[PDB]
């Protein structure tokens, strides 16, 4: 219909592409009289706004108005809201302060914007917090209005969440701070994620006070709304490099596609309203000196597949959200995009931003790799009902390749429980550090293939990680390459067979030749294992007999022992004890209790010269010397008979 698009910009968007923004648009023309008028104004005073509105409304009864702005003056949107209330004309905002988010519109005004609200932005930010399991947080609110609705929305969202959020009490500011009574509430902050809701002027003072407090640490996150994030050019020096912000400022979609979608929505509403009633276009004659409108009609609208439907308050249903961070180059780094319902993440691995400034010494970020072991590291899927690991599990990632022709893969994130997970959680409780837990992709524990290691040994020795919380056997060259901690559990080796006992130990007469006994029996180990190295250092002839007796999997060897495809097996003691304590039937019987066996322990391998080694050696003796290790053994072992 009669639609005028006026644009106030300094960014040189010319007029002729707007005249070319009418031809292929509305290919199936249901309104017969469609006329668009493109205008460009450089001055942004409300005098010219009222003047051009009174010129275009008298200009052959223009019914549609579309406006964008380049500056950051939010009063222009309020002026256009008053103009739409007086003139009864649906006006759309596109860019800048004419499209900023305000508190409460009126039913007397037919002005509409795009994008999300502060409640939908809070929902997106809590979705960010949910996807990263940052459940321990706080909330700091200033005297900027609309704050009690913000606090109540956070409370109702926590009350309507599958998380069970750990929310600290709301730190409410009163005036410009004396730094006497507000500092008492700031020293109560012991959480990690700090939620701040303020304006741009007070944010500098709040971040400077938090930097003076030392509350701008590596674990002390900062997530800010869109309105405090002002000019992209004007960036004060008090921002932490890694400042999380969420705003609808999208550079991939320019103003022309947005005004084309707005024209599509307006013509769709006009064409669907023309079938309901005929005399829909009725405007005011002149400024000097309606029953059926589109104010209550275009709640349902969808153009070109993109669901751009509206709400009953003046917002959209499915907007496009932008998640930006601050790099080390003091620039707003655009990272995250939002889907129609869920959230997309460009960086699935969250970056640390360990140094927000140059004078920030940090020593607590530790990279940990581990291996899947059934009594120790249980790796399972994420819960599809919550998209959240249960509290007693930790997140993990693994670089799993897609196909075998290329080497590209995906870091699939899963959940982890078990025994070493409990050890790592108690170390995080006591030592109070940060961990970076993930899975190994090369293979097993480690094997020197011609002065080349692999697996967790290749991750620790080449210093891509720090330590391994998971279980590891200890021999000579492993103690040569790294430094082990103190052991905590008495786990030697053992032999599983089918009370009578045939094998007495390593001094068995069966360990000489199976031709000596009338049934030719069989026993092997797991491939690529350190037990193989222990046998090859003990007896090479035993390795020569075991070469024809190899197998593949621990559960495969278990099925081979149950059915009868294997006679005996050599493994460690306590893992076989745990597998036999939960087995139905209990036909497989262990041999001894570690008498003619290796009788080694399980330690934590650290790098040569790590400062954490003494603290871990104190913490393990603290965990064993109070029965808490016995509590974990009661939790993760079942001693039957």
């Amino acid at each position: 219909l009669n639609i005028a698009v006026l644009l106030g910009h300094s960014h040189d968007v010319t007029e002729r592409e707007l005249r070319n923004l009418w031809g292929p648009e509305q290919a199936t023309g249901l309104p017969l009289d469609v006329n668009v008028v493109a205008l460009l104004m450089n001055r942004t005073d409300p005098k010219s706004l009222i003047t051009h509105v009174c010129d275009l409304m008298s200009g052959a009864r223009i019914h549609g108005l579309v406006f964008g702005d380049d500056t950051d003056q939010e009063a222009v949107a309020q002026m256009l809201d008053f103009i739409s209330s007086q003139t009864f004309i649906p006006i759309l905002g596109i860019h800048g302060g004419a499209s900023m988010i305000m508190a409460d519109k009126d039913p007397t005004s037919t002005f509409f914007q795009f994008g999300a609200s502060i409640q939908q932005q809070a929902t997106v930010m809590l979705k960010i917090m949910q996807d990263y399991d940052w459940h321990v947080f706080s909330l700091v609110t200033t005297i900027f209005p609309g704050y009690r609705d913000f606090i109540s929305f956070i409370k109702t969202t926590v009350d309507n969440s599958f998380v069970g959020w750990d929310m600290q009490n709301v730190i409410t500011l009163d005036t410009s701070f004396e730094d006497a009574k507000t500092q008492v509430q700031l020293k109560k902050i012991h959480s990690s994620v700090i939620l701040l809701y303020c304006s741009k002027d007070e944010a500098v003072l709040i971040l400077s006070e938090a930097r003076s407090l030392g509350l701008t640490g590596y674990d002390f996150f900062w997530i800010v709304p869109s309105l405090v994030s002002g000019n992209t050019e004007l960036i004060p020096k008090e921002f932490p490099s890694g400042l999380i912000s969420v705003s609808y400022d999208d550079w991939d979609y320019s103003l022309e596609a947005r005004v084309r979608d707005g024209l599509g929505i307006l013509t769709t509403a006009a064409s669907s309203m023309l079938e309901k009633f005929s005399y829909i276009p009725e405007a005011k004659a002149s400024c000097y000196g309606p029953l059926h409108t589109l104010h209550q009609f275009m709640v349902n609208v969808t153009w070109d597949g993109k669901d751009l439907s509206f709400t009953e308050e003046g917002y959209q249903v499915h907007p496009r959200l932008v998640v930006i961070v601050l790099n080390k180059d003091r620039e707003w780094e655009k990272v995250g995009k939002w889907e129609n319902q869920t959230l997309s993440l460009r960086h699935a691995v969250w970056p640390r931003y360990k140094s927000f400034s140059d004078c920030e010494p940090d020593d607590n970020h530790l990279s940990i790799v581990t291996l899947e072991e059934a009594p120790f590291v249980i790796v399972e899927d994420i819960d599809p009902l919550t998209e959240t690991c249960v509290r007693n599990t930790v997140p993990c990632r693994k670089f799993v390749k897609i196909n075998n022709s290329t080497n590209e893969g995906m870091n699939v994130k899963k959940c982890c429980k078990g025994f070493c997970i409990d050890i790592l959680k108690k170390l995080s409780r006591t030592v109070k550090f940060t961990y970076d837990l993930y899975l190994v992709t090369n293979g097993k524990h480690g094997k020197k293939v011609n002065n080349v290691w692999n697996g967790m040994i290749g991750e620790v020795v080449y210093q891509r990680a720090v330590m391994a919380v998971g279980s590891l056997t200890i021999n000579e060259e492993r103690s040569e390459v790294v430094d082990f901690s103190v052991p905590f559990v008495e786990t030697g080796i053992s032999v599983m067979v089918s009370f009578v006992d045939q094998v007495t130990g390593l001094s068995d007469k069966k360990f000489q030749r199976p031709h000596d006994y009338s049934p030719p029996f069989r026993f092997g180990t797991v491939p690529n294992g350190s037990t193989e190295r222990n046998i090859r250092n003990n007896y090479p002839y035993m390795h020569q007999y075991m070469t024809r007796f190899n197998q593949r999997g621990v559960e495969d060897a278990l099925v081979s022992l149950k059915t009868g495809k294997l006679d005996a097996f050599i493994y460690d003691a306590a893992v076989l004890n745990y597998k036999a304590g939960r087995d139905e039937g209990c036909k497989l019987v262990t041999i001894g209790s570690g008498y003619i066996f290796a009788t080694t322990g399980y330690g934590i391998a650290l790098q040569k010269g790590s400062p954490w080694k003494r603290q871990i050696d104190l913490a393990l003796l603290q965990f064993v010397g109070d029965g808490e290790m016995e509590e974990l053994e009661t939790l993760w072992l079942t001693g039957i008979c």
């Binding site: 103190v486 052991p487 008495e490 009788t599 322990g601 050696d617 104190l618 003796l621």
Partner: peptide
């Protein structure tokens, strides 16, 4: 004692028990 001196690797591995007479 780990806070005051340094420790080596343990050579013995055992637990505790109760001496009674029968």
């Amino acid at each position: 004692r780990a806070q005051y001196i340094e420790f080596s690797k343990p050579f013995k591995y055992q637990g505790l028990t109760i001496l009674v007479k029968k």
